Amino acid sequence: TEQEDVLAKELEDVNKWGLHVFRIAELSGNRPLTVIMHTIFQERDLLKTFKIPVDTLITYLMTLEDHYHADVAYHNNIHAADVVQSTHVLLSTPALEAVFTDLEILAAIFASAIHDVDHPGVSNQFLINTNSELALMYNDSSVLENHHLAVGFKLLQEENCDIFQNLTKKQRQSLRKMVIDIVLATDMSKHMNLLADLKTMVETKKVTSSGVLLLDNYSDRIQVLQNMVHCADLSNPTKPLQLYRQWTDRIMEEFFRQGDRERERGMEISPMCDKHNASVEKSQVGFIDYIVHPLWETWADLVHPDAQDILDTLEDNREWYQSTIP
Template sequence: MRLFVRVYLPPKPFEERLSEIFSGPDSGGDGGLDEMAHRLFTKEDYVLLDALTSRPTAVSTGRFLTMHKRRRKKLATRCLHHEYQALLDDVHHGLVQNILKNCGEWAFNAFTLENVTGGRALPVLCVHLFHWYGLLEYFKLDVVRVWKLFTLIEEGYHSTNPYHNSIHATDVTQAMHCFLQEEKIRQYVTPLEIMASLIGAVAHDLDHPGVNQHFLISTSNHLAILYQNMSVLENHHWRSAIGCLLESGVAEQLQPYRGELENQIRDLILATDINRQPEFLSRFRKHLNEGSLDLRQAEHRHFILQIALKCADISNPTRPWDISHKWSLKVCDEFFRQGEYERKLNLPVTSICDQQSTSVAKIQVDSTKCDQQSTSVAKTQVGFLKFMVTPLFVEWHRFLGSPLSTHMMAVLEENRRRWEELEKAEQAEETQTELSEADAAEREEEERQEGAATGPVGTGQPTERDFMPSPPKEIRRQSLAVPTLESLGVRRHSVPVNIEQSLPRTIYRCLEHWQNQ
């Protein structure tokens, strides 16, 4: 069933509303209503529609289903909105042109492009690439519609997400562009595959709510119901992408290619479900071991483009340190926000999202298992780089064997070394803090005993201080056996909080796959 939530549906029982919808002037009376409704909707549709309409939804949610209020970006170029051509000319001033000239470089910085374009990096880069690849001429596309397509996609990203926003989409698209330029790929890809790769890359996280699939499932979100808990977000992303293609009018211009294009976009975006990485990785390894990849075959090109998009999606640790470091902070910021939502909802806090967790030991860099308790940015990075990025990029390098892949591997190694150093420094600092705290506690105890032996001060009665909670020990290690509220079985931050107002309606899950590897 295709579902567009465009209308305001009042919070009446679903069956009643359905009757109203079908008993309009053209419904042909109410005799066949039930029959008609049952022909139109399956049992699952009923469940979904009921979930969707069981609460008052004050406003139309437009083409996106997360119903998350997005703060509109303050765009320097918004005033030119009516004149697309003027907008294109206007933002392409010297600085932008210079950056675009280097958009095939691995050191490309999406944040810089975002700044110099006044927040329009996504459409600016994509329209530029469509020109650059000759896609506008080849498919006889109207540039105004293409601009509209990328503006719709840009607006579909939540600017309030620290990580899953339109800058991430721009970054991944630029990485995909670099991969499309690799000799092994460039000589075989068709214009349709290039177009699908660029649209797939730029829309791969469209309408991402800033929380993971696990959260969506835990909160019985309507998207989880709709997609039966499987690749919930990715299914939503590709369908939203198709919506933008239709709404912009680009789909209409691509009529003869539409089926093929949409299939490719779907498969590319679905491949970015990081839970499916083991499946893709073993297929990729098998091909490489057997030397069976032949990019003259469409099916093999398709597979390699899926792998390319997967690599592009998690390529931030292979970027120069300044850029890479920034992405790491942003992604962890988003994880930690989810942790806060979970805490407020009284849900178990996903370990990687728990900024306040009292982790037991640091990540074992050499072990095969990620530490479930790791929560600091440095720790998640060491784990992520080691267990997710490296295995995929090792194979990607094996396939490409190019100066770019060699460079990416070197940068990845260097970034990993830096995170490991940071992690060690963090560990040393924590140990130092704990020792100081232990010293202070010891001194306090000595003073108390001295006071009890020598002076009249103590009355034997409890004082106000005795009831004051001890200051939070945010990053205390259990390895020093200091009891915490959690180790005593008292869960912190478990006050029931009504966070309906502050929570995005749709949500999801953090990287359990790689934690559990």
Template sequence: FFSAWFGPIVIVHDTGIVQFWSVSSVSNVLPKESKRRMRPMILNFERKDTNHKPTGGTFTNNGKFASPLEPLENLSDSQTPPALHEPETAHHDRDHKNEPLSHDWLKFLPPLFTSCPDPTGKTLYISALVVGQGLYMSAIDLNGVCYTTTLNYTEVDRIRPMQQDFETFFKAMEKQFQERTFRVYRSGAKVMLILKDDICFSLLHNDDTATVMWNMVSDVLESFSLRTSDNSAEGVVQLREQLERLQNDINEEIARKKVLQSSITRSEEEERQNMQKYGSLQNEAVTLTQEWQQMCEAMGLDPADLDNPLPPPASGSYGRQPLATDTRELDISLLVLLKSKYSPANDESDRFRELESPKDRWLKVVRPLLSNEYKTQMKNLPEGKTQLVMKCMEKLDEWDFDVWTLQDMTEQGSIFYAAYAMFLRWDLFRRLEIDEQIAINFFSQVEAGYHPNAYHNSMHGADVMHIVHYILLKGQGKEKLQLKDHDVLAMLVAAMIHDFDHPGLNNNFHIKVQSYLSTLYNDRSVLENHHLAEVFDLMKTPRFNLFHCLKPEHALDARETMIEVVLATDMGLHAKVFGAWKRRLAQNHTLHKRKDDQRLALSMCIKMADISNCGRPLDMYLKWSTKLVEEFFAQGDNERARGDTVSPFMDRQQPHMGKGQVAFMNYVILPMFESIGEYLPEMMFAVDIALTNKAYWKQVE
């Protein structure tokens, strides 16, 4: 009888002799089969002295004993027991090995062990164990007299009180075993175990003492082994993993809640602003109505007769209305430094003479300094915004030109000052005899035509224009394609205006909601057609017509080039344009001989510039990609508010920025950059930068 996991074992032999042994001693005298079965469970036990008081009771769910047994008497650890053999023909009145527990209530009763004196004062050791066919109980005294019984489920159910279910019944039974609140009577070949509510178990004498004792010991050890095995540790690990998963789910829900709260706050703020705008529009409507009535009275017309409105003016633009003033507020001192840097005055006459010839149009607004004056002024330039802008312009011909700093230091004027500097850098003012005032007017209107979107704003226009400038200059695109001055002009203007009046919602959105623009352009490159149409409409006004200086055939050629390359920026046409490029490049690289081939190459240049962020230095790339995702999420919010399906990668509740960027690089950026690098080897470095940026997302993931 195994009295405690750290203590001795009581062994009752078939001879009736009771011995008190430590586990290490027992392992030396058990039969071979018994040793094999017990040794793995007892290797860590140590011998205890004879003064140790063994304890027994119930194995609880945490593997510990409860309720001490009565002290065992007259046992000596020094006694040597005879050999203990399990009888070859032992009669087992229960066999619970490998039998599944077919009733859920069986799990409520762990193996029970206790002791109790019978009416004669002799101590009985009693065990109860659930087995496959029911409840097995055994009792044994110190003289080796054994009693056993087995009750099937029906018999257990018969003695169970009607008001108790099985769980309550067995828990009550377990408690009584622990507290010894039952009574025991022994009469001849029978032992009566009487529990509360007069529940009676009758155990009959069993002569097979060795088998009964062996089963009792093995049941205890097996129970302990099961309760202290690695399965318990695995169960704890599994529970911890489940807890961690649940905590992650909770954190995700909290994050989703914050996103929703932020969206609600933003919606409330937008609603407040819209209500203010609505109030302002109502006031304007009242004012316009009054003015209309006054005008009609002055002209003798009926204000209510709307079928015959006033005739429109004979000429003018019917597209996007220009600014109230032709130009933005200019920083003349900065413009002087920029012009002096790239086109310094040849002599004093450039600074003071009367402007009479068309060749003097480039001096119409700003007169440059002489070279030595410029150097002196730059040397003494105080710290401040102007110094930062000029420092930024030092990298105008470099891949890492910083439009972010330019935007901040010029009152959101990156596209204006970058365009002015690039026209000077290419000497287009003088070579094409461009009227400087018209150019300044045009740059101002284009800058004003960009909306304050997160990504498609004037800074993006300036950035794309700079990359086109870089490809034509440092990438040797102009030289290899043998471009003329009006071709360079067309490309810089196309890059500058390629997202003019972009609403921050892509083509798919317009087509899905059937907006006015999608209807106007028949779902074909909706925004790209709109950008071009708005700018060409603007250029109908003479003071904004940047092509005023070109010959008619050159102006038409520049217009057709602009249309070709801006439409190519529609990513819906990427496969078509890129496929045509690869097929043409596979033939030969002499693309300068035919205008169509030349424009195809220029289309690839502006396409690379439009999505060049993936090939820019990591800090710039992350800024642009974050802004792009921000604009995507804004469209996703719009779609969700409309009840539409949120477009891929535009759901702020399920952000996949890294995944989307890696996929875009794999399927669009890298193949296109490599192909352009094949034609312009000086651009191949962008492939390496794109691979570095792609590796960043893999590290983050």
């Protein structure tokens, strides 16, 4: 159909910052994660490199996407597809060419795909403060992020869902640990310590001629992948403004629906979640100034100059949101 023809040409932009991820979401019938991951796996030749049967991959992605809540405005399968594709671009960057093995690449993309699976649309602090089953299970520590990992790995055990079946013993173990360290690092309560170590690595960065980056142990491979997926998760303000604003509308609706769930239980309303005292534009400027821009500036230095366009878009969008404040 012309229906599938357009999705296929929209998917040609899969290597580009600013992929039309919302139209891909509509064209695929609300399967952006499955089609974007399939494309990225086709693009990186990962099915052959790891002997993943395509119907096993599709079956897993469909199951994985099924476990993102479609009634959650932001932390849904579109956000996962976006973080997947954003990590996929951040991996093709010139300063990181052939720095990561086929396995580590598989870790970064897989972690991005599962990094928010089964997100209920409420924050860790909410889950802790409501004495939820999730916070009880995980002892208030990275509650969501531990749950995303647990579901993402668990779904591999469903019928014809083990996309890692033809990986070796040690490969499965190394992939498992890397995905764990990556997704656990998406917890915003670790952002400051994560950013400090990224600065420390930047202060002492070592590069070849041409500008490819040198890491040596594992404690530096994983932290770059940690900050990369952390950057991809915090990449909305660096996307074209029309994309950024649709993400802003979605995160605010999800915040507000948490604030209503909070107000109806008579709880303290978390920052950003009260629709009756919100300042969406000022909040985006502060969020950029204090969180997103320090992160992406530090990432830009580490990969100089490959992330300049990304950083440029972020500062354009900051200046714009500031101008919407009268």
